[PDB]
C-alpha cells in the first residue's frame, strides 16, 4: 500500500504535532515525528513548499504560545524550537511566503516567551528573533520598537523581566550592524533606553551584554562619546560598593576605542571618579582601577594630556 | 566578544 507523497507526510507530521499533550505513547510519537522531520528540512533541498509555511508556523504557534524554573516538557520544546530554526535557516526559505504568517502578533508573541525563566528557552528564543529580525527586512523597525518598550517598562515600572540579557545580545548584533551615519533615532535609543539600564539594581544580570551595545554605539560614531561617558559617571555607584567593577570594566573598554578628540572632554571628570577608586575602601575596586595602568592606550592619552590628569592621580605630587 | 552573535548590516528601508 503506497503510504502517500513525501510533502504530505510532511503536513500530517506537522499536524500530529499540534495535538498537545498512553501519555507516554503519544509523547514519544510526536518526539520522534520532530526529530523525524529535523533530518527531513535540514538534508533535503525544495522541501520547504508553499502549503508547508502555514503548517509549520501553526504547529509553532500551539506548542509555544502559551502562559508561563526550568520546563516540564523541556525535551519535546527543545525539538520544536530545533526544527523551526532549521525551518527559518534553510536555503528553501522564501520571507515573502513565510510573511503572511510570520508577522506582527507572533513576534509579539515570542517576545512575550523572553519573559521565562528557562535559560535554555531564553538561548532558544534569542537565536530564533535573531533570525527572524535579519531574515525579514519588513519586521525590523517593528521588531527594535518593541525590545525598546519592553526595556522602556523594565526601567521605569515593574523592574523585572527575565531576558534583558538576551534581548541586549540580539540589539549587539544590530548595533554592530548599523549603517553610515547613525539614523537619529539610534542615538535617542543609546541615550534614553540604554544608559537609563546602568540604574536597575539587576544591573549585574546583564551588565556584559548592556556594555557591549554601549561600546558598540561609540565605535560606528564617537560623538555620543561626552553623553556616554557623562552618563556612566552620573549612574556611577555613588556609595563605596563592588559594583564598581562592572562600571571600571565598561569604562576601560569605552577607552579602549575612545577617540583622542573626545578623549579631552571628559577626561578631568573621568580620572576624578576613577582616583577615588584607586583610593576606595574596596580592594577588588581599587585592583581594577590601577590595572588601568597597564593599558598602553590610556598611557598613549595621559602622556598627551599629563599637565592636568597627573595632578589629580597624584595630588600629594603636584603643589 | 564571546556572546556576541553575528551581526545584522542595516542594509533595508523603514
Sequence with gaps: ?319 | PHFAMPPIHEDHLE
Excluded at chain 1, 169 to 195: D, T
Excluded at chain 1, 244 to 259: A, K, P, Q, R
Design chain 1, 1 to 319: 500500500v503506497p503510504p502517500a507523497d513525501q510533502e504530505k507526510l510532511f503536513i500530517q507530521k506537522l499536524r500530529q504535532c499540534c495535538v498537545l499533550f498512553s501519555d507516554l505513547k503519544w509523547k514519544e510519537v510526536k518526539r520522534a515525528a520532530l526529530s523525524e522531520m529535523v533530518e527531513y528540512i535540514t538534508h533535503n533541498r525544495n522541501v520547504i513548499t508553499e502549503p508547508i509555511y502555514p503548517e509549520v508556523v501553526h504547529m509553532f504557534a500551539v506548542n509555544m504560545f502559551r502562559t508561563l524554573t526550568l520546563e516540564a516538557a523541556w525535551p519535546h520544546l527543545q525539538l520544536v524550537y530545533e526544527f523551526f530554526l532549521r525551518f527559518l535557516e534553510s536555503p528553501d526559505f522564501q520571507p515573502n511566503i513565510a510573511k503572511k504568517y510570520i508577522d506582527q502578533k507572533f513576534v509579539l508573541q515570542l517576545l512575550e516567551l523572553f519573559d521565562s525563566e528557562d535559560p535554555r528557552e531564553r538561548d532558544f528564543l534569542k537565536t530564533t528573533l535573531h533570525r527572524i529580525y535579519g531574515k525579514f527586512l519588513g519586521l525590523r523597525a517593528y521588531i527594535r520598537k518593541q525590545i525598546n518598550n519592553i526595556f522602556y517598562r523594565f526601567i521605569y515600572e515593574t523592574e523585572h523581566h527575565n531576558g534583558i540579557a538576551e534581548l541586549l545580545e540580539i540589539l549587539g548584533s544590530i548595533i554592530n550592524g548599523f549603517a553610515l551615519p547613525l539614523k537619529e533615532e539610534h542615538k535617542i535609543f543609546l541615550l534614553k533606553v540604554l544608559l537609563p539600564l546602568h540604574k536597575v539594581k539587576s544591573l549585574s544580570v546583564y551588565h556584559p551584554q548592556l556594555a557591549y551595545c554601549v561600546v558598540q554605539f561609540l565605535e560606528k560614531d564617537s560623538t555620543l562619546t561626552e553623553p556616554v561617558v557623562m552618563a556612566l559617571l552620573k549612574y556611577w555607584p555613588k556609595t563605596h560598593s563592588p559594583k564598581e567593577v562592572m562600571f571600571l570594566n565598561e569604562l576601560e573598554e569605552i577607552l579602549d576605542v575612545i577617540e583622542p578628540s573626545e578623549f579631552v572632554k571628559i577626561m578631568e571628570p573621568l580620572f576624578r571618579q576613577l582616583a577615588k577608586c584607586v583610593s576606595s575602601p574596596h580592594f577588588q575596586v581599587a585592583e581594577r582601577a590601577l590595572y588601568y595602568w597597564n593599558n598602553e592606550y590610556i598611557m598613549s592619552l595621559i602622556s598627551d594630556n599629563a599637565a592636568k590628569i597627573l595632578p589629580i592621580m597624584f595630588p600629594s605630587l603636584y603643589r
